[PDB]
Structure 1
Amino acid sequence: AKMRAVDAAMYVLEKEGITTAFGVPGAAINPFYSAMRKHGGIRHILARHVEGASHMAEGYTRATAGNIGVCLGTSGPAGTDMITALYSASADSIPILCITGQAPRARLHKEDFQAVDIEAIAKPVSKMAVTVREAALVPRVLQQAFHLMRSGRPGPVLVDLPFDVQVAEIEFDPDMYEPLPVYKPAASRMQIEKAVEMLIQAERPVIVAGGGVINADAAALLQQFAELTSVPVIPTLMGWGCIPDDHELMAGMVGLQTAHRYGNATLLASDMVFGIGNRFANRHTGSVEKYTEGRKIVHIDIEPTQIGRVLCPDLGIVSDAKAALTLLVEVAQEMQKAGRLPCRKEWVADCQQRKRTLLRKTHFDNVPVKPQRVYEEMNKAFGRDVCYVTTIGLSQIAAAQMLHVFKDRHWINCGQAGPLGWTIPAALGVCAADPKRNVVAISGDFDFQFLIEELAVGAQFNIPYIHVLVNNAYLGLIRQSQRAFDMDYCVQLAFENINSSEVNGYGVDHVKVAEGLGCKAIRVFKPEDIAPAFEQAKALMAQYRVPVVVEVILERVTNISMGSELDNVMEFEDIADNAADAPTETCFMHYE
């Protein structure tokens, strides 16, 4: 039972579910790596940037309900390269576990090489950030970390391990180690009865299903509750997938950018928002006064201080989403056995009528290619079990408003922080979490470049997925936002590549870069070549077992639909009211 602190840490991590770790080793964290090798049972992926390792951990977590991605680094700048991910994870209410090396305790206040107060730096963007001050506390801090990462509003933790703390001997009985119970508040029968009593008197209600539903692993129950009450569902961007897109009750998405015309119109026509596992995000609502006008609000959240933060709800209930939905289904079934649930045939109908006339054109034959044609071809090329990974840009905004998803955790997106560079490592993290997952990523050229070297991780370790790269040689979104300032300034990436005429002054040759990094890559200039390229990509993945990049050369400037209010979203590109122009809407097409 006598043992190094880091050796005890391996028992804890194992009993606590960890089988994978992403990281970059260093002298200050070598004892940890030594204990991991001696113990076995954890697969280590070596990243080619610490930020990459961080975002891989995020993807690993977000892929499957019980998963906790682990990120490993040395002292000093390794810890400062993980702050963006801790922020991203905090912001979206999901956990990662960061572990950093550190100089010995005696030397923390002498300016020891690569010694920084990572504890103070990480505090504002984690549920806990702590420097472990005793060897015997190493297993206990991890014990406490897993409690915090699963309980209440989930979030990330950073553990900082001084060299001398790691290597010191402790007494530890791993047979005696017990994971702590997970804390979750639960709604009462009375509260839920009031909520359903309120729902039934609404003439035109909608359910807004947030990422909390997914966090609680409660997608089936949400769908069941909507079905029993016959109430249309609007998923948030983070709730996207918790009811399938081809379901009769899914009424679209709402907001300023990643939303549908029918979604916004249905919300503006509704007389109630039944919010479950959502907060009321800035870009979902616009001006709160407008979002709430003539409309009752119910809000169910696991976190007390998220209720009333942005708007004051008519009801507001503190509860885990699974517990609350279990009651909601039970209470709905009792209302149904009495004659107390109203028929909602008409309201459901005209929600669907909006859904098949208020569309956006995707079927463009133009050369150079219009980006909205790319998302049409993706819907056709990939099956219903597809899992999309993306970050930020005109690339992901248009993707969000034109792609379709049919299960929970088949849209992996850092919705609140959106750090460029996220997409590649996040994708790799999902693949490591589930080798059966049909992972497909979307990026613009700038996002693709930030952490482009992480493709070589996918090559070294054989982690295959498909990366769709839509290239306009622009910071697209920013160029569009600069219209209000009457300029086009510091947003172009184009230049004449002295080694590559083929790219026609678009600058970076992503095909050569991808191939040099050990991957496969295909470039597409014409819209009809997109479908064949995706089939080529699937074949290359199967034999070579590496990431395959499909680059599409876009027209330089395309303005994607968006606005500052729900009733104010601007359509720059062609709208559509029939299937010929928008053939991959779920109402017009059966998904594999």
Structure 2
Amino acid sequence: GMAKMRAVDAAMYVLEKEGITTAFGVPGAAINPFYSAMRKHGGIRHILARHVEGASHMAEGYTRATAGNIGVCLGTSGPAGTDMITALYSASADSIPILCITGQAPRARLHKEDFQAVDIEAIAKPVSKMAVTVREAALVPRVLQQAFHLMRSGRPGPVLVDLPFDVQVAEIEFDPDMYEPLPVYKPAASRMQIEKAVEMLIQAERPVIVAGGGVINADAAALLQQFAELTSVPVIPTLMGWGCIPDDHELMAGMVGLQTAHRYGNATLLASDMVFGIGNRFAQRHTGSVEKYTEGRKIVHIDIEPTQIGRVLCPDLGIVSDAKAALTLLVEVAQEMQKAGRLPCRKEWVADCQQRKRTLLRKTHFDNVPVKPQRVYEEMNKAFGRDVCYVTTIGLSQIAAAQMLHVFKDRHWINCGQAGPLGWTIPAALGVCAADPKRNVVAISGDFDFQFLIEELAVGAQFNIPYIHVLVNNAYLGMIRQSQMAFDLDYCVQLAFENINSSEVNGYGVDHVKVAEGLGCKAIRVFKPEDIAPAFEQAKALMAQYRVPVVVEVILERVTNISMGSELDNVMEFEDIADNAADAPTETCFMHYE
């Protein structure tokens, strides 16, 4: 029971009781006592990153992989904590938690300029639910106790706990047998709110459900699908809700927005007369101008967070609720409505939505050399199984990937949708693989994103963490070239150079095969579209043989303008569209996934 121990030793017991099994980090002097407590206790597997920013995005990928996970990022004082701010922001921005833990100078030296002492508490406050420097050894378990409550409760978000060196080694009395995690706070909608929501839905003639990341955050995907099935209401996932209903489900109507969106999704939204928003916010890249998004449409918004309702547009009905609590009641009420014969038939509207989905496509089957990126995603859809789990960040790489890939389960699209920090992809994919070694992880990056934290590939090598990284290389910051067209500009966005060690990259600059191999991984370069499929097959084999990350690099044409625009009804199609399966053969309507 009760025993004297260092505060960091008590921290290990608290972390174990809170369900922690894994951590990502970089040690240093100020945080060594915690690493000492970690070795003494056992039970936490540590993964050494090759940049603190890498440890922080591994923690994010780990949280995002499986409901209830909380990725832990560990580092020392000073610049370790400032290297975590981007992940804290990215996690806050998407409403998911990570636990960052930093060492700090001893308390009695905090406002001297002690070597590598920084006011991380002040720096991190804007991007966290709590950021605190612990000033008493006895408070170390209590601060972690409150941190876990906050990471799980309400709108989730991350916490940073900063530990002065003397506070870590100080002796306290602690009884692990008596430690208990705090209850989690989640408001639940009342039956009166839900019945009103269902009455309005029944009165709608052309409704859609917009299913957001809150559905996934709540672990409520099956209830979301069940509710749409009972009501026969087509579902539009936001980018953060993608996967909560399978992409080949008859009611999944595509995605909506200015960029990661389908032509049929935007058309179905503009044709609808109600948006039943569950666990979404209404993000600007999803809505365009809100006046157009809402024209002629009733709007329902269910959100766990009161100050998200009415933030960007006025709902006709706002309801504060956890999405699982709300969907449980939504299923119950809809079942009562169905037994009563009060749910309308929706065959025509569903058929109209399915007709747009069959016809309003974008071409992917390009035989061009140099390769067209949209062909890469067609080959990815064929190569990988229905259980594929994609990890990606930002770039034309990622935008077209969301337009053209398909996903069939929640937490199989792992994407930092609101903050999009370049370099996120490799560490996030490693964190997912650490969360679930059976998961079939495939990452997508453009060349610039791949370069930011390219050294994290050696983490996969050292720890034998296998996954496939698709690398689509245009030797450009392609997304930025495209947005510079508005200024008739093409300026400081090219990565090309004649590589003095590799004439075979033909002026594309960095040799990603040589870099990946030097970092202990396997790599294949593809120049022709017909070689993409064999390469993915070789990659699966090399992954099994060597158990390390395997990079498949596809050399792209330098310039491809991905479809996008400023309003739902203004998306410009630069590349060829399609109305036939031959040009877009991996749309779920034409292809059986696995």
Match of 2:73 in 1: 71
Tell me the CA shift for residue 444 of structure 1. 0.2
Task: Give the Cα–Cα distance (whole angstroms) in 2 for the partners of residues 340 and 510 of structure 1.
Answer: 60
Task: Give the Cα–Cα distance (whole angstroms) in 2 for the partners of residues 200 and 108 of structure 1.
Answer: 61
- 1:499-534, CA deviations, whole angstroms, 9 ceiling, x for partnerless residues? 100000000000000000000000000000000000
Could you list the runs of 5+ residues in structure 2 that have no partner in the other structure? Answer: none
Tell me the CA shift for residue 395 of structure 1. 0.0
Correspondences of 1:555-574 after superposition (within 5 Å): 555-574=557-576
Task: Give the Cα–Cα distance (whole angstroms) in 1 for the partners of residues 48 and 562 of structure 2.
Answer: 38
Task: Give the Cα–Cα distance (whole angstroms) in 2 for the partners of residues 23 and 338 of structure 1.
Answer: 57
Task: Give the Cα–Cα distance (whole angstroms) in 1 for the partners of residues 352 and 335 of structure 2.
Answer: 26
Task: Give the Cα–Cα distance (whole angstroms) in 2 for the partners of residues 189 and 392 of structure 1.
Answer: 40
SS at match of 2:408: coil
Task: Give the Cα–Cα distance (whole angstroms) in 1 for the partners of residues 392 and 138 of structure 2.
Answer: 41
Task: Give the Cα–Cα distance (whole angstroms) in 1 for the partners of residues 259 and 547 of structure 2.
Answer: 36
Tell me the CA shift for residue 298 of structure 1. 0.2
1:123 aligns with 2:125: yes
Tell me the CA shift for residue 191 of structure 1. 0.5
Match of 1:475 in 2: 477
- 1:44-90, CA deviations, whole angstroms, 9 ceiling, x for partnerless residues? 00000000000000000000001000000000000000000000000
SS at match of 1:522: strand
Task: Give the Cα–Cα distance (whole angstroms) in 2 for the partners of residues 543 and 267 of structure 1.
Answer: 47
Tell me the CA shift for residue 346 of structure 1. 0.2
SS at match of 2:81: helix
Could you list the runs of 5+ residues in structure 1 that have no partner in the other structure? Answer: none
- 1:456-500, CA deviations, whole angstroms, 9 ceiling, x for partnerless residues? 000000100000000000000000000010010000000000010
Task: Give the Cα–Cα distance (whole angstroms) in 2 for the partners of residues 125 and 77 of structure 1.
Answer: 17
Task: Give the Cα–Cα distance (whole angstroms) in 1 for the partners of residues 230 and 591 of structure 2.
Answer: 26
Task: Give the Cα–Cα distance (whole angstroms) in 2 for the partners of residues 505 and 393 of structure 1.
Answer: 21
Percent identity, please: 99
Task: Give the Cα–Cα distance (whole angstroms) in 2 for the partners of residues 340 and 516 of structure 1.
Answer: 65
Task: Give the Cα–Cα distance (whole angstroms) in 2 for the partners of residues 350 and 110 of structure 1.
Answer: 69
SS at match of 1:316: strand
SS at match of 2:349: helix
Match of 2:452 in 1: 450
Correspondences of 1:520-531 after superposition (within 5 Å): 520-531=522-533
Picking from 272, 278, 281, the partner of 2:280 is 278
Task: Give the Cα–Cα distance (whole angstroms) in 2 for the partners of residues 323 and 110 of structure 1.
Answer: 50
- 1:21-56, CA deviations, whole angstroms, 9 ceiling, x for partnerless residues? 000000000000000000000000000000000000
Picking from 139, 142, 153, the partner of 1:140 is 142
Task: Give the Cα–Cα distance (whole angstroms) in 1 for the partners of residues 193 and 106 of structure 2.
Answer: 53
Task: Give the Cα–Cα distance (whole angstroms) in 2 for the partners of residues 215 and 129 of structure 1.
Answer: 22
Tell me the CA shift for residue 225 of structure 1. 0.2
1:582 aligns with 2:584: yes
Q: Paired residues, what number?
A: 592
Task: Give the Cα–Cα distance (whole angstroms) in 2 for the partners of residues 189 and 85 of structure 1.
Answer: 38
SS at match of 1:568: coil
Task: Give the Cα–Cα distance (whole angstroms) in 2 for the partners of residues 388 and 176 of structure 1.
Answer: 41
SS at match of 1:549: strand
- 1:252-293, CA deviations, whole angstroms, 9 ceiling, x for partnerless residues? 000000000000000000000000000000100000000000
Match of 2:186 in 1: 184
SS at match of 1:502: helix
Tell me the CA shift for residue 590 of structure 1. 0.2
Task: Give the Cα–Cα distance (whole angstroms) in 2 for the partners of residues 143 and 487 of structure 1.
Answer: 52
SS at match of 1:387: strand
Task: Give the Cα–Cα distance (whole angstroms) in 2 for the partners of residues 178 and 438 of structure 1.
Answer: 35
Task: Give the Cα–Cα distance (whole angstroms) in 1 for the partners of residues 101 and 451 of structure 2.
Answer: 27
Task: Give the Cα–Cα distance (whole angstroms) in 2 for the partners of residues 33 and 313 of structure 1.
Answer: 49
Task: Give the Cα–Cα distance (whole angstroms) in 2 for the partners of residues 318 and 404 of structure 1.
Answer: 31
Task: Give the Cα–Cα distance (whole angstroms) in 1 for the partners of residues 108 and 233 of structure 2.
Answer: 62
- 1:178-212, CA deviations, whole angstroms, 9 ceiling, x for partnerless residues? 10000000000011000000000000000000000
Taking structure 2 as the reference length, what is the TM-score of the superposition?
A: 1.00
- 1:291-331, CA deviations, whole angstroms, 9 ceiling, x for partnerless residues? 00010000000000000000110000000000000000000
Task: Give the Cα–Cα distance (whole angstroms) in 1 for the partners of residues 364 and 186 of structure 2.
Answer: 44
SS at match of 1:587: coil
SS at match of 2:505: coil
Task: Give the Cα–Cα distance (whole angstroms) in 1 for the partners of residues 179 and 96 of structure 2.
Answer: 25
Tell me the CA shift for residue 404 of structure 1. 0.2
Task: Give the Cα–Cα distance (whole angstroms) in 1 for the partners of residues 389 and 140 of structure 2.
Answer: 37
Name the Cα RMSD after superposition: 0.3
Tell me the CA shift for residue 339 of structure 1. 1.5
1:382 aligns with 2:384: yes
Tell me the CA shift for residue 109 of structure 1. 0.8
SS at match of 1:482: helix
SS at match of 2:317: coil
Task: Give the Cα–Cα distance (whole angstroms) in 2 for the partners of residues 192 and 457 of structure 1.
Answer: 48
Picking from 33, 38, 50, the partner of 2:52 is 50
Task: Give the Cα–Cα distance (whole angstroms) in 2 for the partners of residues 198 and 372 of structure 1.
Answer: 40
Task: Give the Cα–Cα distance (whole angstroms) in 1 for the partners of residues 519 and 33 of structure 2.
Answer: 31
SS at match of 2:509: coil
Tell me the CA shift for residue 543 of structure 1. 1.0
Task: Give the Cα–Cα distance (whole angstroms) in 2 for the partners of residues 406 and 261 of structure 1.
Answer: 20
Match of 1:498 in 2: 500
Tell me the CA shift for residue 426 of structure 1. 0.1
Task: Give the Cα–Cα distance (whole angstroms) in 2 for the partners of residues 444 and 88 of structure 1.
Answer: 19
Moved over 3 A (4+): none
SS at match of 2:125: helix
SS at match of 1:404: coil
- 1:411-458, CA deviations, whole angstroms, 9 ceiling, x for partnerless residues? 000000000000000000000000000000000000000000000000
Correspondences of 1:69-468 after superposition (within 5 Å): 69-468=71-470
Task: Give the Cα–Cα distance (whole angstroms) in 2 for the partners of residues 292 and 579 of structure 1.
Answer: 32
Task: Give the Cα–Cα distance (whole angstroms) in 1 for the partners of residues 519 and 101 of structure 2.
Answer: 28
Task: Give the Cα–Cα distance (whole angstroms) in 2 for the partners of residues 406 and 343 of structure 1.
Answer: 26
Task: Give the Cα–Cα distance (whole angstroms) in 2 for the partners of residues 90 and 130 of structure 1.
Answer: 16
